[PDB]
Enzyme design. Structure first.
Site, mmCIF file in Angstrom:
data_model
loop_
_atom_site.group_PDB
_atom_site.id
_atom_site.type_symbol
_atom_site.label_atom_id
_atom_site.label_comp_id
_atom_site.label_asym_id
_atom_site.label_seq_id
_atom_site.Cartn_x
_atom_site.Cartn_y
_atom_site.Cartn_z
ATOM 1 N N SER A 132 -7.680 -14.265 1.958
ATOM 2 C CA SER A 132 -6.908 -13.653 3.073
ATOM 3 C C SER A 132 -7.769 -12.620 3.801
ATOM 4 O O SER A 132 -8.739 -13.013 4.392
ATOM 5 C CB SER A 132 -5.548 -13.123 2.609
ATOM 6 O OG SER A 132 -4.651 -13.015 3.714
ATOM 7 N N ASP A 178 1.153 -22.003 4.252
ATOM 8 C CA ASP A 178 0.855 -20.550 4.342
ATOM 9 C C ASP A 178 1.659 -19.908 5.492
ATOM 10 O O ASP A 178 1.460 -20.295 6.671
ATOM 11 C CB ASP A 178 -0.638 -20.328 4.534
ATOM 12 C CG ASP A 178 -1.069 -18.899 4.267
ATOM 13 O OD1 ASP A 178 -0.210 -17.979 4.424
ATOM 14 O OD2 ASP A 178 -2.254 -18.720 3.867
ATOM 15 N N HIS A 209 0.517 -19.209 0.465
ATOM 16 C CA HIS A 209 -0.629 -18.295 0.653
ATOM 17 C C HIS A 209 -1.467 -18.167 -0.631
ATOM 18 O O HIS A 209 -2.657 -17.952 -0.487
ATOM 19 C CB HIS A 209 -0.106 -16.930 1.123
ATOM 20 C CG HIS A 209 -1.162 -16.024 1.643
ATOM 21 N ND1 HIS A 209 -2.104 -16.444 2.561
ATOM 22 C CD2 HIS A 209 -1.400 -14.707 1.408
ATOM 23 C CE1 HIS A 209 -2.917 -15.428 2.839
ATOM 24 N NE2 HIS A 209 -2.500 -14.350 2.136
#
Length: 261
Positions: A132, A178, A209
């Site tokens: 991320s 996601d 995610h």
């Protein structure tokens, strides 16, 4: 003969297994320099120096989220440092500096007295990975340090998706479903922005995610792909070319793109 080639000819089976051919030890960094904390994973018996991979966590996240990469990559013949950031709320720019500080310290520790990785590391061959904002961080590391040999961020997120400067070989691991860093607005525009490099986009079917995090149900596929990419580009290991550039042969891949591989 490739001076950087370590371990065997790979197969799908040998890459999908939980560990490669190298026995793994780890230590906690005593005095982290320019990052919060770190765990270094290393092969005891690789047969030569190996490259180093620094792995970043996401916003609010810690080592435990990206820990599974440590023994997975170490066992195939890499020195891996998994890090905590100075703060869990550090932004991608700071995360990048911290990931480069972690590679800097691993490299230092290659020459440090009483280090368990003394002379284990080829400090000219380094890789960046992260989840991320940690993936965004890895891409900023790649843009700022073009001598990095490979990058493999997962579910990447940055305030800008323009990484057209990156010449470092980059595997983008994405999670199809996601909702924190949606593939449409993050992972894909990031992947597409890169014109000057070997690159790949590997999207995990049904993935939330955390689809590439510790305890995920696709370590066979994701492990094989990350190991294959790092071997091909960190070691220049053309025995890994098919695994690095080819389709995964997994029913759990929702999208696959590659260029210049």
């Amino acid at each position: 003969t490739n001076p950087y080639a370590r371990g065997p000819n790979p197969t799908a089976a040998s890459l999908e297994a939980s560990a490669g051919p190298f026995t793994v030890q780890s230590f906690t960094v005593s005095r982290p320099s320019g990052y919060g904390a770190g765990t270094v994973y290393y092969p005891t018996n690789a047969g030569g120096t190996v490259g180093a991979i620094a792995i970043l966590p996401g916003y609010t996240a810690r080592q435990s989220s990206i820990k599974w990469w440590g023994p997975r990559l170490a066992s195939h013949g890499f020195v891996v440092i998994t890090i905590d950031t100075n703060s869990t709320l550090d932004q991608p720019s700071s995360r990048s500096s911290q990931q480069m500080a972690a590679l800097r310290q691993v490299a230092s520790l290659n020459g440090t007295s009483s280090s368990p990785i003394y002379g284990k590391v080829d400090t000219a061959r380094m890789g960046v990975m992260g989840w991320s904002m940690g993936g965004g961080g890895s891409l900023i590391s790649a843009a700022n340090n073009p001598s990095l040999k490979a990058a493999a961020p997962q579910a990447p997120w940055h305030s800008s998706t323009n990484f057209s400067s990156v010449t470092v070989p980059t595997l983008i691991i994405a999670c199809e479903n996601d909702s924190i860093a949606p593939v449409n607005s993050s992972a894909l525009p990031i992947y597409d922005s890169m014109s000057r490099n070997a690159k790949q986009y590997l999207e995990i079917k049904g993935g939330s995610h955390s689809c590439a995090n510790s305890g995920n149900s696709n370590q066979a596929l994701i492990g094989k792909k990350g190991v294959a990419w790092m071997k091909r580009f960190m070691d220049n290991d053309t025995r890994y070319s098919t695994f690095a550039c080819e389709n995964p042969n997994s029913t759990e891949v929702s999208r696959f793109r590659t260029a210049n591989c």
